[PDB]
Design a protein around this ligand. Structure first.
Ligand SMILES: O=C1CC[C@@H](c2ccccc2)N1Nc1ncnc2[nH]c(Br)cc12
Length: 167
């Protein structure tokens, strides 16, 4: 039993809700919140910009130190950093950005990072400003993640379409 509330159950382990991931994180304080990161951990917009703003830029300060020490992430890769006031940990995961021309096959590799954590609050990777089809992203999530994932979808119109079309 965990503290997530109001989710529709898609599969044994995948759940979905129309919610702002920022407000959901602030309420649940999950062990792991997933960020829709880029390789430079520059949290300027989309989910990343919103999560970082909610930390009063502390996520960005921590991220800049991480990059100065370790260099950029790989597309499809991840790193674990602090969750600040939102969660215990933030798993920064880099899905391919279609608006940069990156290989959508890397989306499965991106979701594989979730399997290192028993329970996660997460957005749909490569959706939104990353330019991929969110229906496809949900399919890859369901077919790749085996741990318990609670997906927050900000756009209500998109949420209804994802549910109505789910196989
Ligand atoms: O609906 C969706 C589906 C695609 C996803 C997204 C991911 C990265 C960049 C842009 C969009 N997205 N957006 C949010 N998903 C969850 N929580 C959110 N909070 C805010 Br603000 C936006 C937001």
């Amino acid at each position: 039993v965990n503290s997530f509330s109001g989710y529709l159950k898609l599969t044994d382990n995948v759940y979905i809700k129309n919610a702002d991931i920022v407000e959901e994180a602030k309420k649940v304080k999950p062990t792991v919140v997933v960020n829709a990161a880029n390789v430079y951990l520059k949290h300027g917009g989309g989910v990343a910009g919103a999560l970082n703003k909610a930390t009063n830029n502390a996520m960005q300060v921590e991220s800049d130190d991480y990059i100065a020490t370790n260099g950029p992430l790989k597309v499809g890769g991840s790193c674990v950093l602090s969750g600040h006031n939102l969660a215990k940990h933030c798993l920064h995961v880099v899905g391919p950005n279609v608006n940069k021309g990156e290989d959508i096959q890397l989306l499965k590799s991106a979701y594989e990072n979730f399997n290192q954590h028993e329970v996660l609050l997460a957005p749909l990777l490569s959706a939104g400003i990353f330019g991929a089809d969110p229906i496809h992203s949900l399919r890859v999530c369901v077919d790749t993640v085996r741990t318990n994932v609670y997906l927050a979808v900000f756009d209500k119109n998109l949420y209804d379409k994802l549910v109505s079309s789910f196989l």
